[PDB]
Amino acid sequence: KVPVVGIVAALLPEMGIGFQGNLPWRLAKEMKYFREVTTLTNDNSKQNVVIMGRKTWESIPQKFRPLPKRINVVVSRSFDGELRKVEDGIYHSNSLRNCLTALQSSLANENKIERIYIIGGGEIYRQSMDLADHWLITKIMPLPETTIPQMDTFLQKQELEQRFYDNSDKLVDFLPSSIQLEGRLTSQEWNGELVKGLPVQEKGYQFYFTLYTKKLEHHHHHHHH
Ligand SMILES: NC(=O)C1=CN([C@@H]2O[C@H](COP(=O)(O)OP(=O)(O)OC[C@H]3O[C@@H](n4cnc5c(N)ncnc54)[C@H](OP(=O)(O)O)[C@@H]3O)[C@@H](O)[C@H]2O)C=CC1
Ligand SMILES: COc1cc(-c2c(C)cccc2C)cc([C@@H](C)C#Cc2c(C)nc(N)nc2N)c1
């Protein structure tokens, strides 16, 4: 009953997302987007959750974690529970799946989570294709004289485009209502793929804010008592 939204910055056409434990670029504009979307709420009395695997958590600079003004969840199999406060702004979980069910209980959450953002990394994302309702994917492309950075971690585009369709026509309406975006929506061919979303350029790169949504599903079974 609260939306689960995967959120990621990926380099086309392989959807590379990391190299040696870090992000393969540093794009202040893309960071600001991620910051604002995961922070901001339509309802001022709620926060969002950001869920991340242990290795992602360890890569965030120390002064910047836990990410402010959001409920942070870190998942490690060597942690104790489903969902345990360990510090102000910090929960530990030994289970991606059980922590989401725990987060969804209106009794625990008092209907004061707006959305649950899954913020990485590779392993966490692999596991989120059948959990997320939507994906917010920043599609990044090096400009013509930009060197393609090396990378070692990938979003599963196959499984992506299996389960979700490109709903970037609704991206603007989907974002919290006070975010402001520099570009208008824009369909552009790039190395044999349709790239649709909201353009920016920074450093050696062009990127598009896009939204993917779950495809429609046939009615095979509903559970009856
Ligand atoms: N471009 C982007 O938007 C983003 C990219 N990244 C990139 O991703 C890379 C990191 O990804 P990756 O190395 O795969 O690591 P993750 O951040 O996905 O962490 C993986 C760790 O998470 C824990 N974990 C995984 N599944 C579960 C589960 N079901 N339940 C409980 N714990 C679980 C385990 O911790 P343990 O070993 O402790 O048991 C595991 O080793 C880096 O390069 C980083 O820069 C990260 C965020 C965003
Ligand atoms: C790997 O090490 C990281 C460092 C930071 C980080 C840095 C480098 C500087 C200041 C503050 C922070 C939090 C953040 C992240 C993660 C949580 C991410 C992400 C993300 C981004 C950036 N964009 C889109 N679209 N989706 C995302 N999940 C990882």
Cα–Cα distance, 79 to 217 (Å, whole number)? 36
What gap in Å lies between CA 148 and CA 25, rounded to an integer? 10
DSSP string, 62-113: GGG-SPTTSEEEEE-TTS-SSSEEEETTEEEES-HHHHHHHHH-HHHHTT-E
CB atoms < 10 A from the CB of 131, how many? 15
Which technique was the structure solved with, according to the deposited record? X-ray
- List phi, psi (to 5°) of 52: -145, 150
Distance CA 209, CA 139 (A): 6
Amino acid identity of residue 31, one-letter, is M
Three-state DSSP state, 127: coil
* Pairwise CA distance, residues 206 & 200, whole Å: 6
Tokens of 88: 């102000």
What is the sign of the dihedral through the CA atoms of 182, 45, 99 and 224?
negative
CA distance 76 to 55: 9
Task: Give every CB contact of residue 12 below 8 A, 6+ residues apart in sequence.
Answer: 139, 140, 141, 190, 191, 193, 195
In Å, what resolution does this model reach?
A: 2.1
Cα(7)–Cα(39) distance, rounded to whole angstroms?
13
Query: Which residue type does 100 have?
Result: L
Query: For residue 213, what is the enclosing H or E element?
Result: strand 205-214
Out of 30, 114, 171, 198, which one is annotated catalytic? 30
Q: Kindly state the tokens that stand for 217.
A: 């599903």
Q: Which ligand is nearest to the CA of 56?
A: 1
**What CATH superfamily is the domain 1-225?**
Dihydrofolate Reductase, subunit A (3.40.430.10)
30 is catalytic: yes
Instruction: Evaluate: CB of 140 within 6 angstroms of ligand 2.
Output: no
Six-digit token string for 90:
């910090």
Buried b (16+ CB within 10 A) or exposed e, 102-117: bbeeeeebeeebbbbb
Mention every residue, 6+ apart, whose C-beta is less than 8 A from residue 156. 15, 125, 126, 129
Strands 134-142 and 153-154: unpaired
Q: Is 5 a pocket residue for ligand 2 (Cβ < 6 Å)? A: no
Bridge-based pairing state of the strands 47-53 and 71-75:
parallel
Look at residues 37, 40, 32, 67 and name the one whose alpha carbon lies nearest to residue 52. 67
Pocket test for ligand 2, best of 25, 26, 31, 72 (most atoms within 8 A of CB): 31
The neighbour count for residue 28, using CB atoms within 10 Å, is: 9
Which of 14, 75, 131 gets mutated to test ligand 1 (max ligand atoms within 8 A of its CB)? 75
Q: What is the DSSP track for 29-65?
A: HHHHHHHHHHH--SSTT-EEEEEEEHHHHHHS-GGG-
Q: Measure the CA angle with vertex 49, ends 47 and 55; round to 5°.
A: 145
**198 near 183, Cβ under 8 Å?**
yes
Are the CB atoms for 104 and 2 separated by under 8 Å?
yes
**How far, in Å, CA of 131 to CA of 137, rounded?**
16
Q: Which residue has the tokens 């242990």?
A: 54
Specify binding-site residues for NADPH.
9, 17, 22, 54-56, 76-77, 96, 121-124, 127
Q: Among the options 11, 12, 23, 83, which is catalytic?
A: 23
Cα of 126 to ligand 1 centre, how many Å?
Answer: 10
Q: Using alpha carbons, select from 153, 211, 197, 209 the residue that is nearest to residue 30.
A: 209
**Contact, 185 vs 195, CB < 8 A?**
no
C-beta separation of 117 from 51 below 8 A = yes
| Residue 23 is among the residues annotated as catalytic for this protein | yes
The response to whether residue 138 sits with its C-beta less than 6 Å from ligand 2 reads: yes
Contact 48, 38 (CB under 8 A): yes
Q: Which of 28, 10, 6 is nearest to 141 (CA)?
A: 10
Helix H or strand E segment including 196: strand 193-202
CA dist., res. 183 & res. 181, Å (int): 6
Q: What is the DSSP string of 139-154?
A: EEEE-TTSPPPP-SEE
